[PDB]
């Protein structure tokens, strides 16, 4: 499997036409602060293709 191709799975809002976003800021899904790391109901925004 080639897992070196990433796509954005989580984002706070939608993109505008031809807008670029290559940030790695973690996404908070729950109401509990993730403290900018990872863990309970918060994830790294990028996902790999198998």
């Amino acid at each position, epitope marked *: 499997g080639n*897992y070196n191709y990433l796509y954005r799975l989580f984002r706070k809002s939608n993109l505008k036409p031809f807008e670029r976003d290559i940030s790695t800021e973690i996404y908070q*899904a*729950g*109401s509990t602060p993730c403290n900018g790391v990872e863990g*309970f*109901n918060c994830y790294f925004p990028l996902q790999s293709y198998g």
Partner: antibody
Amino acid sequence: QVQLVESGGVVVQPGGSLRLSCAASGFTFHDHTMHWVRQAPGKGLEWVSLITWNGGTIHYSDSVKGRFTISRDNSKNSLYLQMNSLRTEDTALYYCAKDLGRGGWYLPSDAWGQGTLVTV
Amino acid sequence: QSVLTQPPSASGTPGQRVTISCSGSSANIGSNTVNWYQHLPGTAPKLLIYSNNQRPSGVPDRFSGSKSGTSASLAISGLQSEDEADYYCAAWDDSLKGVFGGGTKLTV
């Protein structure tokens, strides 16, 4: 093309020590948290346990806490569940499932295995 | 014999819209997010809704939901004969661990 394949769904004497094994492919294994969920016949879904990618934390439902052990091997892309002190109440279709994203964790997401039947 | 509470069944005429409710404590819904699953008999369960109202790839806009107060609900519009499945409510507990509801049987 994510797949999860369970094995070990056999009929076991309650006094035994059956282990289940889930093979995983089609996604990054070593960065993802995984869960076990079981469905007893005639009932709904019952959550069993989770293990995070780095082994940083493990959680068990009280009904299996202290009697089940969850472990993973990131070099084999496989998840294991050891179930001891078995009860007839443990008869269920056991499913292997993964979380939504990398690093963190919450509940089983979109990719579920076919599961295998454990009879006690 | 579950923490999250759901009705035993739901029904309606194809083309109509129905809702499936889910209730629990502040430790289940009030302080956490609710996920929904659609389990079609004969195969594995699949995620339908996550984080209250988000959809995974492959799930159409006929499936939506919300969370308010200490309760949550799933709305299924455009009922199809292929949606005759058991819908499950789930959340992470503050005292316990992972929690699933009884499951609501939706029928034509």
